[PDB]
Enzyme design. Structure first.
Site, PDB file in Angstrom:
ATOM      1  N   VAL D 322       0.854  -1.171   0.000  1.00 37.85           N
ATOM      2  CA  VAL D 322       0.000   0.000   0.000  1.00 37.85           C
ATOM      3  C   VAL D 322       0.903   1.238   0.000  1.00 37.85           C
ATOM      4  CG1 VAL D 322      -1.919   1.161   1.207  1.00 37.85           C
ATOM      5  CG2 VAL D 322      -1.747  -1.318   1.302  1.00 37.85           C
ATOM      6  N   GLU D 323       0.610   2.176  -0.902  1.00 39.51           N
ATOM      7  CA  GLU D 323       1.392   3.411  -1.096  1.00 39.51           C
ATOM      8  C   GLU D 323       1.690   4.196   0.180  1.00 39.51           C
ATOM      9  N   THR D 324       0.753   4.168   1.127  1.00 36.52           N
ATOM     10  CA  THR D 324       0.910   4.877   2.405  1.00 36.52           C
ATOM     11  C   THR D 324       1.772   4.150   3.458  1.00 36.52           C
ATOM     12  OG1 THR D 324      -1.273   4.018   2.997  1.00 36.52           O
ATOM     13  CG2 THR D 324      -1.240   6.181   2.084  1.00 36.52           C
TER      14      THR D 324
END
Lengths: 512, 512, 512, 512
Positions: D322-324
């Site tokens: 996940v990018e975050t």
């Protein structure tokens, strides 16, 4: 007289300084189990050293809930210097054989309470209860109508008494409080609050501390390190600091004998990723297991059961418990599921918590009686043997049919006796009883005797031979090797062929 | 009959489904302490609802080691529907008054074992021991020479028996095993292995589960959540899964009554950063403490001592323990030092582990006997009162000299009785004894009675008045307010002036 | 080519096998700091062994973010076999002097980026950014108008470029991605997911792994043990397993050099409960601190500041940070307050995070420039010296006025120079600049030079002598020991009397 | 203007008192992601209240590294009151639509840096680096040759410029430091040292705190609770206390929007035990995965890939990130494998770390350019779309071929279009480019376009139609529904039949 707590801090001493507080005739309780498990080694060492130098202190009484040591010169064997100890009560004797040598020779007073009962009596002593009432031990050598747990001639005082409640027989075991404790933990704070994060288990460390404490005694605790007051997690603390009188710090403290560094798998913190007569016995023993059952495998010819279960793919379909506290796990063991204190584990056993147990035997008589606590002129003691064989639902005795350099080979799907044992284990009458066939039948329990060549079941008319190994002659190898006549089952069969083949059995675990 | 374990997983049911397994006349043991501590609320609720709708099951027996509830309609009060409960044995009775109302009205058979002894008998029952031998309760209403722990007329069967061991008197308390358990944990895995990371304490959850399990009963456990098999830390697991027969998952489970979210200070995971008659009594009570002493958190007028010690800056110089297991901490307490199981805490108390104990009183008689278990026509029961007042080294009773809305003001370094209490507490003879003055003297114990206006000590010739509050008349406010005549100490002094001044006393705690 | 991940499992190899994957002319990045911190020692040993036996691989380039080793033959010194290494970029050079020896002899190409910048460029290379823009190093030897961070005559290629942004001067530092990494962790699961629970710190392990990974290289990681897949806490995992190509397990892995068993105070898991010229400088350096200020733990004569603050009772009133990431703590620190990764720590420093900065000096010139990276004909390199002296609010240089076995006696509240140093440190012109006096003034920074005998401050017109030690002659001991004339402050005073007294100073830390 | 630390304690204030420290024209940086992830909600609320009531403060600049809110009136929408915000720079715009409404109407100056770049520029600002050099965004609307990141007409000042290094093209993104930060953690000690034990992730909290701190700004941190100084685990602390200037305690703080109680599976502490067009697209997207691949499944029609993988039994053979920050896990996510800080996650992406990325499209043009940041006259912003589509090895665009009330149905192994979409998504020319087909082909990347009825691949001569759904007509349903003509592959085939069958595909993931 204990050293004072300066500013609330528990006194920290060298082991040498600590043992100087033991007076003559002190009753010393030693925490620990086999192979260095939770053993305060520096304290034992200091006390042995003091006596070797000064011949003081004198005439100590020892309470050892279980057997410490390596079955040789470690454990409490160093305390077997003559004059140091006058009296001992132990749950297991053979693990520190120098002490049992003294008992054998009538040089000390010597008792053996069942290990489970013994730790229960220390918990009673903590509460100033005079003793405990239990039917554990009825009909065995601990029963006063036999030996009352006395191991030799010189031991005279009756500690165990027969009593009656609800029109039933029970034994009353006297609770004896110790004056001194050698306990141990991993870590404690400056006030003595102690955690067990790297210990193999807990045993009955809290119980021992409370018993000594409430008897106005001195609790001495070995730790690996000490930390700032009130920085341990309260739910990890197993011993409140006010129970501890002296701390000894041993920064080189090892989880087990051998000096290996801390193993965090052993600690519980991480998840870890040959066909002979012993494998044969373990295999047939597995046949007695069922899905969802709670068991206990004992040290000896059966301790391979877990491995065989893993080989067979059913090790996750039942649970094996260890008498000292650990529950589950694989070969100390790792990947345990839980660790109870030893006393609580025994409470569970006493109430018939075990569906199946596996115990070794030294001798079996015509009555189905089993002996393990004395044989070959030697004192071994019970360990948890009585606690486990008294009320478990199924009792599976495991061993070879003969002893004294027996050599066998399992080849071509058969058992080959290449050298018969010198000694008959199946005898007419046990000189002393560790397990009563009569009581087990009165209790409705299912009793098996598994050997490499033959399998028996206890019935009202004695042992029935129910299975015979391939490659073995009934008359010459079984009947000529027992000093009693067993009933031959009309259903007599060959032992399962798969047992004798060097390949996975395809054993499928039954569900009751 | 219990639901089958499918795939080795513990059966998971709603509370409603789970209680359908309770047969008529089963013996139900309920885990929990006051105000929701470790209470399996959804199971109590479901059982109550089922009886409300169907009037089944019928004629249950209840065992409640300590008091559950809020002194009103919670706890096991919902179970006081007529026909549901026939028989009850509780360590405390006032915390669920609807149940104690049935006892007062002679609608149920009703017994009060000392809370500590009660939980020990459950532990004995796990081990199939028939009962326990204890001098706790000798000379009180639990003594069979008095009431034998029977609370009303309809209760007839003797459960407690006088016995003798080594020419000493003891009580034998029969161990009763339950058929059903309502227990609780924070978390368990798919096989029922349970951790208590967010629970206020442990109480005797394991003991209860073992007792029911080894009696072939059904153990039902409420948890907040379930996790994957074998992913919990083995040293955090308090209840092995094989003891659990049914799990009920309540995602909204609360640490205490009131629905508040989880408090991680209460869980033990994090360290947290008016002069009236009650504070007066707590201050004088603090004078009985010394550095390094172990005392207990008192329930009632005694509960303010910790806060006073904190105000005086001596709170870290001694330790207070809680009967139910927690040790240390500040105002469910936070910043605790350790948490023991409840049974082990009482083992410690029974052996005289408390140097100082603080207890409330409802009535005191001319012999120094104290009553709390019954007064004002009501059944309160003991809680841990007998377990703590039996052998603790200094027994400090705390309360006001009169009852029935007594109002006082502390003004000008004096006590002003502005509205005298309606009821005399110091009476000639206790109708029922909770604490025996004679036994305490036999045992060598130091007994104080602290009131807001007067302090007494128990001696062989009765109560000696040793201190009198400034602002009070001996004749009118003390002597006229007692139904017997105390000995007036020739050393009679005023209560310490600082006790009556609304500033820090500058109290210095006596040396260890 | 990297070995395939069988069934998603990270390949596990011996160090010997692992290093066979390193081809000629690879760029190797080596994790670690001084004294064995986070050093994959088996991988360095195995590579050095390989070259000694086979004279392969050949012509490697090394990138070493900070100095590894013991200032002797450990660290990456074993890699200083001629033909093995041809090129090296390091943040510190003197910790592995066999490598710096090669650089001194023009045997390798040799660059020194400031340690903070170097780890930032590796982070840049992970992102395929071509380089970074920073004013760190402007006006020093790393500035291309000077030496461009080139350490010898053989080093020719420009890595650093002068650039302009927002009317300001910056350096552009080329980001070089490595092809091979030697990293390390405590534990990893079967897929390579790694935790650092027992490591002294984190350094820039993740950054190194990403830089090599995204450059199609091979990441090799030494660990102490391996655990079952997905059993580690996700929030303790510092390196995602897909970043790791080969694991080497070293069960004997030690936190630092010296083979000591794991110390759990060093791990961060538990809270731990002579007046010479060096202590004198530390005392006077402490005078520069104030409540609430953020400082750095110095390397050298500054390192005693924490112990002086503890002696003086003000250690908890300010915080000292360690360049490699630890924050706070006491003497590997224990009782740290936090541990950041190394790159983030330098991010903080570069932006002027430090209120006070303590640094050693080998030489100072008339412009207030300081030299540490070269002196006495040897290469030491910067470590974090430039990163910390570039923008910190107060820059406090600490050291003796002369070098070469200066011996002093502090008796009777005075300094007595008993053996003068053979080497003058205060020279007219630094041959190579580590810190620019001019840039410090432009940046508005407060600059101090503390010695055992004198204290100076940098001003626009040069060094001002502000303090002189009692017992020292201005002309003979100071002026004659400098190759330039400082301004003598009109306000020149004696150094504080208490500094030279062998008792606690009663020092009061200045307000925030 | 920041409150003094009294005795080293970080100031604790209500949110209302806290926002009072924000002056006119401050630059406010706000931590958080979608749906309340790490949102300091009380601080946003209090700022918004202040302006509603007092019309102060005025003309603030907002930096939002990513999109906060619920795509409605939460997040920073409350801050869209006219005159409060003058200038905004966000990585995503559609999550708080009230702010983007302002941008759409030319009411505020509005920029969109790619999310990853934006968080990198804040980290560079912490270090006082003026900007970052990156090829991320070359050939898109952020390229100054196009829109330069500007979202409307009123936005004039150039923040992004073209530069050159190593004879290659790069973007230089200016680093802007904020003066105020709204950050959040779970817990902090009395000096501000903060842990994230119950937060969904970490995002870039430390980066934001350092950026603001080194700009002489004020860092405001919301926590759930505060604890005693120096009692948190140092390896758990993510933000050093000296970075925090004001703490706001919200005891009711929730992990996500909706006020659900803390979920300890979400925290990371425990291991948890229909065929439509969306599933169809997810299924065909899965075909692009292989064993050992590192992927990123994005917002929208793609997000079902994990569930499909679980359904087909191959979910454990590859890893999604996940990018975050979170890595692995199942449907916030639970059972995650690790959690990186957001900036480090984007470092990994920027360097081509993803083997496969899955992205949604609003519009596709004839060149293969994809638009998502603007469509249908609304500003959506990039999120991490550009950071991920720039260099990932395989870029899988996922969507329907048309939009605006498109209804389809899948059965009998076919696609049935029951109501065609109103809006054509394949247009001649993108008004603004979010992804460049030319740049992707230059970088040698494999670019797919998956719809419910057709699959394309980008080549040098445009989009090749390579697959067509069963049940669909080429001319009427595809060619007539596009504003340009695709190349028809000579190898054009029917999309896999199993895709359109409501049963498990028996899909095998290709080898590594």
């Amino acid at each position: 007289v204990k050293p004072p707590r300066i500013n609330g801090r528990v006194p920290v001493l060298s082991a040498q300084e600590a043992v100087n507080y033991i007076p003559d005739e002190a009753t010393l309780c030693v925490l620990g189990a086999g192979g260095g498990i939770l053993e305060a080694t520096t304290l034992i060492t200091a006390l042995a050293d003091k006596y070797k130098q000064t011949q003081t202190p004198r005439n100590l009484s020892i309470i050892s809930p279980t057997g410490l040591g390596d079955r040789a010169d470690r454990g409490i064997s160093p305390l077997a210097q003559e004059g140091l100890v006058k009296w001992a009560l132990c749950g297991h004797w053979g693990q520190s054989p120098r002490i049992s040598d003294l008992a054998e020779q009538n040089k000390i007073i010597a008792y053996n309470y069942p290990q489970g009962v013994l730790t229960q009596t220390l918990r009673a002593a903590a509460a100033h209860q005079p003793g405990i009432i239990s039917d554990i031990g009825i009909g065995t050598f601990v029963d006063p109508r036999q030996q009352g747990g006395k191991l030799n001639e010189v031991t005279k005082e009756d500690l165990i008494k027969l009593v009656e409640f609800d029109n039933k027989e029970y034994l009353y075991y006297k609770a004896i409080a110790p004056d001194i404790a050698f306990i141990r933990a991993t870590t404690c704070d400056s006030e003595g609050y102690a955690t067990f994060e790297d210990e193999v288990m807990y045993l009955d460390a809290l119980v021992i501390a409370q018993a000594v404490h409430n008897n106005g005694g001195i609790v001495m605790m070995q730790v690996q390190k000490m930390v700032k007051k009130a920085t341990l997690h309260p739910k990890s603390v197993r011993i409140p600091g006010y129970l501890v009188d002296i701390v000894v710090v041993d920064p080189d403290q090892s989880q087990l004998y051998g000096g290996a560094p801390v193993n965090r798998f052993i600690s519980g913190d991480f998840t870890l990723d040959p066909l002979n007569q012993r494998k044969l016995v373990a295999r047939r023993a597995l046949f007695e297991m069922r899905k969802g059952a709670v068991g206990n495998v004992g040290v000896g010819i059966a301790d391979g059961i877990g491995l065989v279960a893993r080989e067979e793919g059913c090790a996750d379909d039942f649970i094996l418990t260890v008498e000292t506290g650990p529950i589950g796990g694989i070969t100390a063991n790792v990947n345990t599921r839980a660790i109870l204190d030893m006393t609580s584990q025994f409470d569970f056993y006493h109430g018939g918590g075990l569906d199946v147990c596996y115990l070794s035997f030294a001798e079996v008589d015509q009555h189905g009686n089993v002996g393990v606590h004395k044989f070959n002129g030697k004192i071994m003691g019970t360990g948890g043997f009585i606690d486990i064989s008294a009320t478990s639902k199924k009792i599976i005795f495991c061993g070879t049919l003969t002893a004294g350099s027996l050599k066998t080979e399992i080849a071509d799907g058969k058992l080959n006796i290449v050298q018969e044992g010198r000694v008959k284990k199946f005898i007419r009458e046990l000189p002393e009883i560790t397990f009563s066939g009569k009581i087990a039948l009165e209790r409705g329990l299912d009793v098996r005797y598994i050997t490499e060549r033959a399998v028996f079941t206890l019935k009202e008319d004695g042992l029935h031979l129910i299975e015979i190994a391939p490659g073995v002659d009934l008359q010459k190898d079984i009947l000529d090797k027992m000093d009693f006549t067993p009933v031959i089952s009309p259903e007599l069969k060959l032992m399962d062929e798969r047992l004798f083949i060097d390949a996975a059995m395809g054993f499928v675990l039954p569900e009751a």
